[PDB]
Symmetry: C3
């Protein structure tokens, strides 16, 4: 009966008790216990409650336990958490730059956001396009910086358009369930890809996607510093606080997202319009920063001294690329290789 040591361990304990944990919680996630506002190294399932109160005011047997035991004697802690812009860089991202890349504004007749990454299809026509958040509203036409009806811009491409077993074994509410996801926009045939850069302007050259391994120690992901560059807030930095967040409505889970990020220094990590931004691990030892997710477009009580903070939903990048069968392009050389290999 060993203590949990990985994201998978926490996720199976959380799943094993999910039906009961939804009875007294708004949702759950996995990470490290947060105690007196500070991150611990104690693996835990984070339980989100509408209002966190002292034990004395809870009904008998309404107090969440401190420990949970899953299959095989693997155990973990239980942690209760309450769930209640103008710069040179932003100016370049929104249309004043001579190149298009990560951070650039992308807009349709219906939505607007940030271009996350330049990617290519692994198979088939091997088209070169970009990756951004999947908006929750088929042939949606993407322009930078604005669609024709609102102002000038070039046509980038159309969003590529693409379950019962979720409601069966995950207990999702089929009427309301949404899993945070990304979308692939292949570049239109007549779009000039020589105007594309693989650099992230506010950070610099990035390395290849950092795959989130669910069996490695938790401090590989939880507590890591990240940054993002988006059209609305420019450059911001945050911390990865949790993984595999489940959110609950009255009849089951209604929201899942892979990554939870909180901005540093009680500052918001993202604003509306930053959805699609690349979530990047900042470099701690001199290596190139590596992306881990995409921002997907409530407040979180972390300190008792200050008010609740905004939180950010992220899509696991490595699993997104696998699901869409895409490769990230991180050099101009790789990009020119990808372009000439389009069929």
């Amino acid at each position: 009966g060993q203590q949990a040591n990985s994201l998978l361990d926490l996720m199976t304990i959380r799943a094993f008790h999910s039906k009961i944990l939804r009875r007294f919680s708004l949702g759950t996630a996995v990470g490290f216990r947060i105690r007196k506002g500070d991150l611990t190294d104690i693996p835990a399932i984070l339980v989100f409650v509408a209002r966190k109160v002292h034990k004395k005011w809870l009904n008998p047997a309404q107090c969440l336990p401190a420990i949970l035991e899953g299959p095989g004697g693997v155990w973990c802690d239980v942690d209760v958490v309450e769930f209640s812009m103008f710069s040179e860089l932003v100016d370049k991202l929104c249309g004043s730059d001579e190149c298009i890349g990560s951070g650039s504004q992308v807009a349709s007749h219906e939505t607007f956001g940030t271009l996350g990454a330049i990617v290519k299809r692994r198979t088939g026509n091997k088209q070169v396009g970009f990756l951004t958040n999947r908006h929750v509203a088929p042939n949606q036409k993407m322009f930078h910086p604005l669609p024709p009806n609102l102002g000038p811009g070039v046509y980038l491409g159309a969003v590529e358009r693409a379950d019962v077993w979720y409601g069966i074994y995950a207990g999702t509410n089929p009427e309301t369930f949404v899993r945070a996801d990304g979308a692939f926009i292949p570049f239109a045939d007549d779009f000039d890809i020589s105007t594309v850069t693989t650099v992230v302007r506010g950070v610099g050259d990035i390395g290849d996607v950092k795959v989130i391994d669910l069996q490695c120690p938790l401090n590989s992901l939880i507590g890591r510093q990240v940054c993002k560059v988006g059209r609305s807030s420019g450059h911001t930095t945050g911390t990865v606080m949790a993984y595999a967040l489940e959110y609950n409505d009255e009849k089951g889970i209604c929201f899942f997202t892979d990554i939870l990020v909180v901005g540093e220094n009680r500052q918001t990590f993202d604003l509306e319009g930053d959805s699609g931004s690349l979530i990047i691990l900042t470099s701690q030892d001199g290596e190139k920063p590596r992306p881990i997710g995409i921002i997907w477009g409530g407040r979180l009580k972390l300190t008792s001294d200050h008010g609740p903070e905004n939180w950010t939903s992220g899509v696991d990048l490595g699993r997104l690329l696998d699901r869409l069968e895409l490769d990230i392009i991180i050099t101009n050389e790789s990009l020119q290789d990808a372009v000439q290999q389009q069929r």
Copy 2:
């Protein structure tokens, strides 16, 4: 014909001219004249008007006089004030709203219909001598929880509200039969130990109440300090009477919505314990402007229910030490 020297003097003068004063005012109160934004020592009837303008733009019949004489030649000043009915995050507020291990003055109390602040720990003077708490009376029992009622969130059941123009009033919630009173403290967190209620004497000099610094601890704004600006406020739109008027210090609001029921406490000027004089009244909590200086915009004002007169009418005694509280629990029948 001596000048007015007490609250009673001002009020008897005010009553004698009541109809005449209401004809061109939203309401009246008694206190000290406010001149060039500063409090004077000049006893005055405060006349509250929707919009204060220079006399040159007023018709003579609407211009208020500067002096009024009541029965027996007792006289006072008349002071015109622009007025209207219409118009956070800290360790302390967190404790008041549910994270503390005790319940007391400042603690959040809520029902399915209302929410506010617990003002004082009190007991019935006679009969069964039940121990309960005092808060504002909101304008079929309304049974109260800390911090939240079952339909909105977690909390312990405190008790049901006892039911006793709108006059500002407080209400007594006797603690439920199964409530653990050992979780109650008579300390006002953020202020300390308080002394006994300070009776508002209507015949002593005005400077005992008007102009005194006060503080309150409430679930919405934590600790704030202010000044008592007037007594015996009467309002008539076309309506409501409250005992105490407070304006927050440093052009900062004295209360926010949810602070109603908070204890209004005279700060200690010489080393004695601070003494309560009132309870914040709900309604007019967030609503209401008050022009005090022409340098700054209008300021918020707060309504207070006279505590000493509230306790008498409900026949309650305030409990101000945890020893007195332990005793009162043992004497309940």
Copy 3:
């Protein structure tokens, strides 16, 4: 083929190229080129666009040229500007009803609207009535109990004295269809920013009126905006305004002769554009009608040049957000249009009052 050297030079160039300038812009004005957030001394036509973007995202049809040449070879620059279409003090308190006099900056209100008194004026001819000048409200219900001005409030809202009734606008050249077609106006929507004259009521006590501008002081005579003199007499000059909502503010004149577009043509014209100094707004709602006054950095008395017109992004630098802009009505031309003279001393007012017929 000389460079443009006056407002008239820039405006004739702008007219000669009206079709090209209007096809992809929200509007145009004339002034000095703005570069890297700063005013230059380069005469230019300002072209206002909803979003300013890099050349790489523009079709050659939509990319504006940097220079335009008109008839006779006279040329100028073209500058692209990103565009679009409550304060408490001792002064504001006096302006809103606590002062013992009425004058420029005082609050004036009707049953429907409120604003600022601009200037004390008199008719040149006829009965030579004394009154005041304020903005002409558009989209307002000007029917019998709505042209009645009071200070500070109308009888339904509070106390105040009756000042007079707004005189309907007698005109414009825009109303001539023949001229309108040549200028490209849309008749269905076009609005000319304008002022209005309120003659004082027969029983209004004019001895309660002052010609002083509180917060600035005594003013000189109206400064006529000359269209053939060098641009730096107006463009870039610092101005101030006293109004009921924001009290005293200072700004800079950024452009002249703004023409604003809609789907069919020109729908708004105003004479002056002002931007507040130090990234702070020049006006708030209710300051409309305030006198726009040239500040005197020399020792002469400040001179009025316009009136604030009432009821825009104008993003100038990349580090700061968009700034508000203010529409001003050319005072000298407004006075000519309404056949009015401004009264600038309290002795001169008494003369005009005794000279009323």
